[PDB]
Amino acid sequence: NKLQSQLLSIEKEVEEYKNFRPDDPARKTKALLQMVQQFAVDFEKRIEGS
Amino acid sequence: NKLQSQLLSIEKEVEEYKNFRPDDPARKTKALLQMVQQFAVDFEKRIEGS
Amino acid sequence: SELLANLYSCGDQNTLMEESAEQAQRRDEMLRMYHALKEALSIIGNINT
Amino acid sequence: SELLANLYSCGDQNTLMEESAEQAQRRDEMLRMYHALKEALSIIGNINTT
């Protein structure tokens, strides 16, 4: 049960690493879009208080 | 004054329309991000009232 | 958290993000409007002398 | 509305979105952990089967 719990908490993330490539413009583009979205949302939450 | 007002109103959008090029993946990506954000905001609005 | 990644991961994002023909007409009409307004304003400013 | 449009205008879009060394080290450690953890669960399986 402990080993399965750790695997459940890692497996959702290591999917990006297993296929990691030093040259991958699609991965870079989607990471950019997600981080920009997260920045805008975090700034709005932090200053508005919502 | 009427013509200056009309130019001021239209300029914000013609500034982007004048730069349209069919082969522009960045324009497509920007539209994608904007539309996804609008969807998420409208959904939260209609479900939570935020 | 995921909708953006799910949409981007689809192939042929070009077809996925094709604009409606109505939008292709609207932007061109606005470009013509902009140029005509600038030309008219130049003429009015010049005639005033 | 504008931040992404400006980010696409900076630099040369080649060095932007380049991973730091720490993310590469974390990637390697996470993949090692993942594979060893699956191996541990395989061995527990075999022991219970006998």
| Nearby residues of C33 by Cβ (< 8 Å), 6 or more positions away | B10, B14
Q: What's the token pair of residue B2?
A: 């009427």
Q: Which of D34, C10, C6 is nearest to A12 (CA)?
A: D34
In which element (H, E) is residue C16 found? helix C13-16
How many CB atoms are located within 10 Å of the residue B29 CB? Answer: 19
CB contact (8 A) between residue A29 and residue B32: no
Give the Cα separation of C33 and C29 in Å (integer).
6
Subunits with 3+ Cβ pairs within 8 Å of C are A, B
Q: Resolution in A, one decimal?
A: 3.6
What are the chain C neighbours of B40 within 8 Å (beta carbons)? 3
Q: Name where chain D breaks: residue before each gap, C-N > 2.5 Å.
A: none
Give the Cα separation of C12 and C48 in Å (integer).
55
- The residue ranges of DSSP E strands in C1-49, in sequence order, are none
- Side-chain half-sphere CA neighbours of D10 within 13 A: 8
Under 8 Å between Cβ of C41 and B24: no
Report yes or no on chains A and D touching (3+ CB pairs under 8 A).
yes
Under 8 Å between Cβ of D7 and A36: yes
Q: By what technique were these coordinates determined?
A: cryo-EM
